[PDB]
Design a protein around this ligand. Structure first.
Ligand SMILES: CC(=O)N[C@H]1[C@@H](Oc2ccc([N+](=O)[O-])cc2)O[C@H](CO)[C@@H](O)[C@@H]1O
Length: 155
């Protein structure tokens, strides 16, 4: 609304979405597309979407692309991450260390078919995070819907 953004972030086996101030900026419910970690970067004064990516970190090399991308994001941006299906198999140590450095608690621990939603300032702090661990190899984490108020910059 004013000096705040209302952000909603959904992570699940079959669907991700992100809404900012009641507007859907990401929605992917397609079968067999969009696996991995979805990353949205917002301008920290307006909430406008600066970048939207998906890294299929179930597959090799995509976490390296994610690291290169995230390292170019400015510290003040709002960073949103959400998993569709599976984002951990090839989320390797450099990517996990990068998520840890953002203050993410669940990202560095992401496991097989876990669901994960994250909203934070690139240079810290984290504003909201949710995580559900998959209970079995044949299962997924529970869908998570994170609703977070994000402060906006001004002056
Ligand atoms: C057909 C299917 O259901 N494929 C799915 C399966 O792929 C695999 C393939 C092999 C193994 N295995 O035997 O270790 C596990 C998951 O899981 C992936 C991660 O959730 C999905 O992206 C694929 O869409």
């Amino acid at each position: 609304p004013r000096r705040v953004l209302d952000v909603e972030v959904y992570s699940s086996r079959s669907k991700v979405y992100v809404a900012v101030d009641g507007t859907t900026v990401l929605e992917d419910e397609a079968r067999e597309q969009g696996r991995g970690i979805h990353v949205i970067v917002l301008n920290q004064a307006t909430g406008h979407v600066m970048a939207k990516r998906v890294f299929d970190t179930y597959s090799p090399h995509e976490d390296e692309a994610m690291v290169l991308f995230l390292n170019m994001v400015a510290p003040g941006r709002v960073l949103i991450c959400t998993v569709k299906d599976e984002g951990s198999f090839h989320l390797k140590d450099t990517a996990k260390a990068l998520l840890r450095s953002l203050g993410s608690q669940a990202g560095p621990a992401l496991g097989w078919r876990d669901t994960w939603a994250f909203v934070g300032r690139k240079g810290g702090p984290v504003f909201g995070e949710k995580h559900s661990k998959s209970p079995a190899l044949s299962s997924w984490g529970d869908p998570v819907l994170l609703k977070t108020d994000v402060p906006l910059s001004s002056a």
